[PDB]
Amino acid sequence: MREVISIHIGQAGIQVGNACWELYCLEHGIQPDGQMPDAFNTFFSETGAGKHVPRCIFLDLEPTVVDEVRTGTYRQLFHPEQLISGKEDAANNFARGHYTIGKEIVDLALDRIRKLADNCTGLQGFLVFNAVGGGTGSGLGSLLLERLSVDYGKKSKLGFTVYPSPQVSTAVVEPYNSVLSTHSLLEHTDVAVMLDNEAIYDICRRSLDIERPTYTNLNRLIAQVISSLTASLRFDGALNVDITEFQTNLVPYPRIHFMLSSYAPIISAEKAYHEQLSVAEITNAAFEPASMMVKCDPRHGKYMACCLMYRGDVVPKDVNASVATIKTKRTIQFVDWCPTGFKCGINYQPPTVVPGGDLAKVQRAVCMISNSTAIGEIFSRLDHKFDLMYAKRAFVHWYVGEGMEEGEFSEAREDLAALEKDFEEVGAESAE
Amino acid sequence: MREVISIHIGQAGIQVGNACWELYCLEHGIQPDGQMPSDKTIGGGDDAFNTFFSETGAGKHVPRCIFLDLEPTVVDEVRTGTYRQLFHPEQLISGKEDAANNFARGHYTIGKEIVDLALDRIRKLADNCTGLQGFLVFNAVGGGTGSGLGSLLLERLSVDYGKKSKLGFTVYPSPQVSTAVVEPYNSVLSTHSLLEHTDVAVMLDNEAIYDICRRSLDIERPTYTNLNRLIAQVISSLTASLRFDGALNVDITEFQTNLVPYPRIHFMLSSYAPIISAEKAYHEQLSVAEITNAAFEPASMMVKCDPRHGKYMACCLMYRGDVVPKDVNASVATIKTKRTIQFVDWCPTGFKCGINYQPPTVVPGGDLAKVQRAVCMISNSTAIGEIFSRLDHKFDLMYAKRAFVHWYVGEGMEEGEFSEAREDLAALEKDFEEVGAE
Amino acid sequence: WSTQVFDTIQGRLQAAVDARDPAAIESRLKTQYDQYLHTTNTKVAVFR
Amino acid sequence: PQPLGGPGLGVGFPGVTPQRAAAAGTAPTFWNWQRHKKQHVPGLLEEVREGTFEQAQSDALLTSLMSTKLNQYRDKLRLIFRQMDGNRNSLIDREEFIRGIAKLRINVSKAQVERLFDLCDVDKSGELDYEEFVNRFEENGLASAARNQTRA
Amino acid sequence: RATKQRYEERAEMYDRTRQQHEGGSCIFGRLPPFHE
Amino acid sequence: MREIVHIQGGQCGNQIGAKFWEVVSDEHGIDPTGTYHGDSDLQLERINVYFNEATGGRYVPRAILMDLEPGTMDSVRSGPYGQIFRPDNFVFGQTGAGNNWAKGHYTEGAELIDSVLDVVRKEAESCDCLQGFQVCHSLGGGTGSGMGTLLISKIREEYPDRMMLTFSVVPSPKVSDTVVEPYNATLSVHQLVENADECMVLDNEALYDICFRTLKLTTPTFGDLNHLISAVMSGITCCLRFPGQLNADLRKLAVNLIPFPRLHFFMVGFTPLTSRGSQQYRALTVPELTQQMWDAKNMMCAADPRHGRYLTASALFRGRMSTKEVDEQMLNVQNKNSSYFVEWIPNNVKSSVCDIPPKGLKMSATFIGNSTAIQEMFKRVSEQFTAMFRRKAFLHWYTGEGMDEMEFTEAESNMNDLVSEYQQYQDASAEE
Numbered sequence A: 001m002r003e004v005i006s007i008h009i010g011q012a013g014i015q016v017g018n019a020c021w022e023l024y025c026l027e028h029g030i031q032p033d034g035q036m037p038d039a040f041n042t043f044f045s046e047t048g049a050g051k052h053v054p055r056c057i058f059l060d061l062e063p064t065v066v067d068e069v070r071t072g073t074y075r076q077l078f079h080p081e082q083l084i085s086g087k088e089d090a091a092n093n094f095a096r097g098h099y100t101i102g103k104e105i106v107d108l109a110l111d112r113i114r115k116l117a118d119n120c121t122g123l124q125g126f127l128v129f130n131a132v133g134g135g136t137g138s139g140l141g142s143l144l145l146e147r148l149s150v151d152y153g154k155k156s157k158l159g160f161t162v163y164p165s166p167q168v169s170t171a172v173v174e175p176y177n178s179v180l181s182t183h184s185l186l187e188h189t190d191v192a193v194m195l196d197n198e199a200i201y202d203i204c205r206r207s208l209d210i211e212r213p214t215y216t217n218l219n220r221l222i223a224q225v226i227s228s229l230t231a232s233l234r235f236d237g238a239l240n241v242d243i244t245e246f247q248t249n250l251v252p253y254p255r256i257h258f259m260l261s262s263y264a265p266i267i268s269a270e271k272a273y274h275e276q277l278s279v280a281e282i283t284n285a286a287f288e289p290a291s292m293m294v295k296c297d298p299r300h301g302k303y304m305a306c307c308l309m310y311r312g313d314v315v316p317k318d319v320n321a322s323v324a325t326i327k328t329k330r331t332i333q334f335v336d337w338c339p340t341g342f343k344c345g346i347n348y349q350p351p352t353v354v355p356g357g358d359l360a361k362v363q364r365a366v367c368m369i370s371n372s373t374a375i376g377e378i379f380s381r382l383d384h385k386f387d388l389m390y391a392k393r394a395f396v397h398w399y400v401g402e403g404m405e406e407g408e409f410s411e412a413r414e415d416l417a418a419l420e421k422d423f424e425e426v427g428a429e430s431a432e
Numbered sequence B: 001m002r003e004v005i006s007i008h009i010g011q012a013g014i015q016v017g018n019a020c021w022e023l024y025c026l027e028h029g030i031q032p033d034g035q036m037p038s039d040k041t042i043g044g045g046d047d048a049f050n051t052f053f054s055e056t057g058a059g060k061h062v063p064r065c066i067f068l069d070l071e072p073t074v075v076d077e078v079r080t081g082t083y084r085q086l087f088h089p090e091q092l093i094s095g096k097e098d099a100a101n102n103f104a105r106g107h108y109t110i111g112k113e114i115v116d117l118a119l120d121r122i123r124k125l126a127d128n129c130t131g132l133q134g135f136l137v138f139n140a141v142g143g144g145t146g147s148g149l150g151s152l153l154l155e156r157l158s159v160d161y162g163k164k165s166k167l168g169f170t171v172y173p174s175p176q177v178s179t180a181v182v183e184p185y186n187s188v189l190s191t192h193s194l195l196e197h198t199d200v201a202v203m204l205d206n207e208a209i210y211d212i213c214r215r216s217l218d219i220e221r222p223t224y225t226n227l228n229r230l231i232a233q234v235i236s237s238l239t240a241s242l243r244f245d246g247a248l249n250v251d252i253t254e255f256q257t258n259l260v261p262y263p264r265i266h267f268m269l270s271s272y273a274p275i276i277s278a279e280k281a282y283h284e285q286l287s288v289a290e291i292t293n294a295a296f297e298p299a300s301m302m303v304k305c306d307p308r309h310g311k312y313m314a315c316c317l318m319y320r321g322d323v324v325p326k327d328v329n330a331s332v333a334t335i336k337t338k339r340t341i342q343f344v345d346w347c348p349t350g351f352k353c354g355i356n357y358q359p360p361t362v363v364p365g366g367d368l369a370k371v372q373r374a375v376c377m378i379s380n381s382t383a384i385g386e387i388f389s390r391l392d393h394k395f396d397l398m399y400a401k402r403a404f405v406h407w408y409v410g411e412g413m414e415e416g417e418f419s420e421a422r423e424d425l426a427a428l429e430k431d432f433e434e435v436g437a438e
Numbered sequence C: 001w002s003t004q005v006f007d008t009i010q011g012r013l014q015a016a017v018d019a020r021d022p023a024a025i026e027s028r029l030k031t032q033y034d035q036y037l038h039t040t041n042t043k044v045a046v047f048r
Numbered sequence D: 001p002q003p004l005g006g007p008g009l010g011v012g013f014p015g016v017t018p019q020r021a022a023a024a025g026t027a028p029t030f031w032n033w034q035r036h037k038k039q040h041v042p043g044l045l046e047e048v049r050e051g052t053f054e055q056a057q058s059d060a061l062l063t064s065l066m067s068t069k070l071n072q073y074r075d076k077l078r079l080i081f082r083q084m085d086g087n088r089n090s091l092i093d094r095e096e097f098i099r100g101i102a103k104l105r106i107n108v109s110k111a112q113v114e115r116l117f118d119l120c121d122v123d124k125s126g127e128l129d130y131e132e133f134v135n136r137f138e139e140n141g142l143a144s145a146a147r148n149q150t151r152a
Numbered sequence E: 001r002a003t004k005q006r007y008e009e010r011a012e013m014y015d016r017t018r019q020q021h022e023g024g025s026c027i028f029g030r031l032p033p034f035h036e
Numbered sequence F: 001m002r003e004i005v006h007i008q009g010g011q012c013g014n015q016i017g018a019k020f021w022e023v024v025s026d027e028h029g030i031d032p033t034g035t036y037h038g039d040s041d042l043q044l045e046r047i048n049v050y051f052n053e054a055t056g057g058r059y060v061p062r063a064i065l066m067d068l069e070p071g072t073m074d075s076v077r078s079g080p081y082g083q084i085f086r087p088d089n090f091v092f093g094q095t096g097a098g099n100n101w102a103k104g105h106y107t108e109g110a111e112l113i114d115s116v117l118d119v120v121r122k123e124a125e126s127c128d129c130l131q132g133f134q135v136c137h138s139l140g141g142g143t144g145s146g147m148g149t150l151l152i153s154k155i156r157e158e159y160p161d162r163m164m165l166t167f168s169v170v171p172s173p174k175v176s177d178t179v180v181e182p183y184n185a186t187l188s189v190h191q192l193v194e195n196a197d198e199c200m201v202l203d204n205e206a207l208y209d210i211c212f213r214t215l216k217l218t219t220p221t222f223g224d225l226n227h228l229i230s231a232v233m234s235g236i237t238c239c240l241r242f243p244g245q246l247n248a249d250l251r252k253l254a255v256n257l258i259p260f261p262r263l264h265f266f267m268v269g270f271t272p273l274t275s276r277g278s279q280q281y282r283a284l285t286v287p288e289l290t291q292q293m294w295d296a297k298n299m300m301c302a303a304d305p306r307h308g309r310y311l312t313a314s315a316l317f318r319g320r321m322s323t324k325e326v327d328e329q330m331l332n333v334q335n336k337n338s339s340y341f342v343e344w345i346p347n348n349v350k351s352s353v354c355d356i357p358p359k360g361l362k363m364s365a366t367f368i369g370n371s372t373a374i375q376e377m378f379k380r381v382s383e384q385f386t387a388m389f390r391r392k393a394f395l396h397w398y399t400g401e402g403m404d405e406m407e408f409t410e411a412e413s414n415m416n417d418l419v420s421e422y423q424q425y426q427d428a429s430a431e432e
């Protein structure tokens, strides 16, 4: 049986983890207590288990966000052994999460990985949820990703890392943690997907008319992106996109594995009735820069490979028409070495709505994950923040004292400059 | 009828037997009054309780046990406890003065009078039983009464009841934490007594049970009542096959024919696999491979020695409840391929499996939760040589200055047979080395 | 095929890329991204 | 052709009939055969029967068992109070106390639980507080010493 | 007879409570005894 | 008109033989009380081979029930079809062999084999003409091996002109249920090659692979193995009890399968074994029964039939069926892969057709295989014995009952002579 083991690391990992497993349980009808709703029925409910346990691990070195799950509305879905806590958090330090205090828990975390790998029949991939701005997301994320490549081969690793916004941040050592974490995602992660908090705010503010959004409103639609991309494994459809279909069609080269994301029908409950939502106009709104989860302009770069994943009652006739209308637009630019630039997946299940959630019931949705050379636009802004802070060598005695050396700063910076060069070389075109 | 006699010697023996017979009353439905309530429409359940309880008159069941102690302050707690009516009033045997951590008093001075009354009650219980299978002796090596009177009793049972198996469940001195000062003296003297007299020995370490209660039942302030409760699960699962029918029945004579290679090597280990607390359990069913792996883990083992150092000479698995014969073979097969556990080169196939059909029972208010599957593993290994040489070092540094010897030589015991017990323990250490050597 | 086509076009590509010095790429991408952020700051939405 | 007519009673062919003989089976009868009723703690009483020495012994043994169960960690009493409040208030109600005892899995009757709740409710507010809970379930409290004090 | 029949029927009901397709097995697992 | 006397021994043979009396009584129409309620007049055709006569139409089996522990006869009598046995045949000991060959063969067997033989001599003198003695027991056990082979030696001296079928189970190479199995296996075989006329080798871990992969049984219980064994032991005798086109008695299968007095070990098979859910999916035909017959995963012995050449073989087809199709198929299986058959025996495979099929199916077959590949099972048992006997491990439990260590020497000298004799006839060409 096809399956994916997910790993949620840090503050942002398991707050999305509360949101993603909220949507996962509603998609399959799983109740919050874990049991999906004559002598066998008594046997199946009490002595045996009709309970479904998630194949996730919720690990963080700070217990406050972990015990919220242990005491929340989903206390019975997860195994008590499955959620991992710690004494002291990595505390906005890649040095603590990767060398000093992340080393003690990463041995315990892989033991629960081994139990989840033995429980499954056939494994397909790994989902990693973390934030590259925090110490636990960067440090313990890099430590877990480094070890997962050692014990496990041919099993892909999917990354959904919340990268920092260019303008607003909730931390000051934010450029340092992301630069050091970036070198680990290039080396050890098969597919990484950028996520930007400021872009989610603009989607919530404009297309969903919420003036005062919080992290609960952000994670509800990030979970919509995560649930849609793995939805071809859970449900059947006219065209399927497996987790190995996703690698083989969105990384032309091994180093380029950074993809954007977009969800097309972000329409509120009041605005839904007036809106006509067919396949032709949601795909036009899918490529809209206001509808992207990364604060970047895709017109700056050019798309290399793009995957349009559809949910609901979508015929294959009109997704091809949406492909043709996008390819003829002069603003959406493709690179010249990828003529067949699209992969289309259709899932017959309409997107479920979280009860009390902001999104309305729509019968059509597009989850657009695209490989573009506009990722180098994101990493260039984050590089210039790193160069100014490293010139004065501030916030370095925290990293140097807790195990790291000075040479790791220049080493991870040099890898990112190669990626800046890598996009400018791959995105180059041949004309006449 | 398959039926055994359990003797409990000393304070540690009688306190285990208070918890050991507590679970025996609950499996067979025997009330603390001693009367079995009528259930459904059955003619009689005679084969169930006859192994431990003798039917007396109409609806009265009395245990086939002897609780003998030189001190009355631990035997009167049974006489005034919840089970005051269950026991025969003269099966509980008291004394005037205790041995008081002295092996000389329990063997020579004061243990000689009370051992005569012990065989009188043993002869009456052996006459009541049709076919006796073996004496299950429970005692403390580190106490004066358990080591002293236990040495004198097992010598008398060997002479009278020849060739009948004697399964020894002995509380043994611990490496780090121990409650008495002259325990290395009392431990070395009884080792010569139980080397050649008892046939199967099961070593129980109190600190080992402390470690198990801390990490499995998640209690870091346990009590000897909590300790003796999961000791009772080990003995009950060991003789579970006599009480209840199963696919692969393992009797007491099935134990000694498979679990000892040589007559002088019989010191075994113990482990009880599913140990989950009352609250932590919720709805948790554990796989047969999971509990088999948990049985062989060194942390879940009930005597303080690491199996990784030694070689498993022989091993048996007592399974209980709804376990099928296939997945126990699937569980054993991955143990053989697991290189962190090792078998000796002259025993290429070293497993025995006993599958009983009765799921284990839980006492009310007990720490253990109701589980449908269980493994009780007792294995013979060369890691016991770490145990016996550990207090060999303790006894050697104590006997050199001849401290705590004037008590022992004063009470009839001679000076010269300290060295007889030490040389016997020295030969036992050499026996474990050459057998386990490739 | 390798020597006539692939080695030649990769030589041209790597020559142009090595001619491009990285600081120019970070300066240009920083200016473009700052322009985009300025437009989406001072303007009500950006539309493709 | 079936010259051996009828399905017959007893086991038949592998892959055709189940292992169980048709004379004894074809119904899920003994999947929950326990052979013995659940055994209570010997000191407890199902009914109240207040004002008696047996009731005093039952209350003392129940409180001693509760204290020994809740004083196992260093902070198990606080943890159990948090797990038993349920409705996120700092106070404990009747149904929450019942559910907590059922979670602790001591087989105690409903009237006996209500009696224990009434003795715990010192201030008669219809609701336990943390002070009342810890005062009843101290590690060697007076309600635990009532087990020793049987002659009163 | 009752003990042996209980064992046999519990084995049969374990057989029937396995080989059951939940349909959402990509992100969910029943329990290790049914995933043996 | 010719009768077969069944002996079951030990814990293993009692539960195995109980399921044999489960199936024959139903297949001949005997209800659990003991009377007759089948509606077929062929059920009453040859009842005398496995049932005696009694007043009121009661039929009791010709079974002598044997063990040194009274625990199993509580279990045998308690189940269904357990009241059809005569209580005089319930000869039981009190102590128990306890997996010791010395206790079963010498001390506790000689005290019981006198009373056992009086029951066997009662049943032999009662019937008209003995076809042979059938015994189902164990080799790694203590009562089915120690005292089971004691009865074989005693009853061969009393009746030397009669047949002998031993459905004996053997220890597995992978996992052993008893540590002293190689001692009891090697001592049994030396006492069994000289006495037993022909032998059928069963192995539990060959049956576990049968239950998991052919019957689709995820958690096969202990008695499902016996029902596969019980069908073969009922299928070994289909020509005796019922008419047919070709009749093969026990002596007919003796003369066609053993070419030499010491090569009398078989691996036995069972053809029409599909899962319950695949009763409509599997199309039953004579090529289909033939194909699953010769499949190596179908054999009820742990030895691999592809490793050694088949010396001889036999097929016992049941049902209204065409003699030309088997006769063409048996030529086909001999000529498709001639390397798996010995050259100096033409017509390796014997065929017998019974026109009355078993209950619920219209075609069935039972396969007996005299293969030289069974020496691989004997060599693995031999390697266990030499490793243990060199260091005198577990030997004081055997010399305590009077069996000297010199007895163990010839237990191996005839053991390795078997695998030497089985190797030479495999290596034998038509010339030398």
Ligand SMILES: Nc1nc2c(ncn2[C@@H]2O[C@H](COP(=O)(O)OP(=O)(O)OP(=O)(O)O)[C@@H](O)[C@H]2O)c(=O)[nH]1
Residues within 6 Å of the ligand: A009, A010, A011, A012, A013, A015, A016, A062, A089, A090, A091, A092, A093, A131, A133, A134, A135, A136, A137, A162, A164, A169, A170, A171, A197, A215, A216, A218, A219, A222
């Ligand atoms: N989308 C989203 N992002 C979040 C959420 N919570 C935190 N973040 C991101 O996390 C970043 C802050 O770093 P954290 O993830 O909190 O750091 P951490 O995981 O606690 O690691 P340590 O500080 O070492 O314990 C912010 O910039 C946010 O972008 C959330 O609920 N949703």
Ligand SMILES: Nc1nc2c(ncn2[C@@H]2O[C@H](COP(=O)(O)OP(=O)(O)OP(=O)(O)O)[C@@H](O)[C@H]2O)c(=O)[nH]1
Residues within 6 Å of the ligand: B009, B010, B011, B012, B013, B015, B016, B070, B071, B098, B099, B100, B101, B102, B140, B142, B143, B144, B145, B146, B147, B171, B178, B179, B180, B206, B224, B225, B227, B228
């Ligand atoms: N496991 C376990 N060990 C016990 C228990 N009670 C006592 N012990 C052990 O007994 C040892 C002390 O010796 P005792 O058994 O009390 O002494 P004794 O056998 O009564 O001999 P005397 O005191 O001279 O009469 C301690 O080291 C404990 O390890 C018990 O309830 N459980």
Ligand SMILES: Nc1nc2c(ncn2[C@@H]2O[C@H](COP(=O)(O)OP(=O)(O)O)[C@@H](O)[C@H]2O)c(=O)[nH]1
Residues within 6 Å of the ligand: F009, F010, F011, F012, F013, F015, F016, F097, F098, F099, F100, F138, F140, F141, F142, F143, F144, F145, F169, F177, F178, F204, F222, F223, F225, F226, F229
């Ligand atoms: N197929 C099958 N094997 C069995 C059965 N009962 C026991 N065995 C096997 O017999 C061996 C143990 O036999 P044992 O009880 O020691 O025989 P005994 O010493 O004569 O009583 C184990 O390897 C079991 O696998 C059964 O009913 N069916």
Ligand SMILES: [Mg+2]
Residues within 6 Å of the ligand: A010, A011, A062, A089, A136
């Ligand atoms: Mg944090």
Ligand SMILES: [Mg+2]
Residues within 6 Å of the ligand: B010, B011, B071, B098, B099, B100, B143, B145
């Ligand atoms: Mg004492």
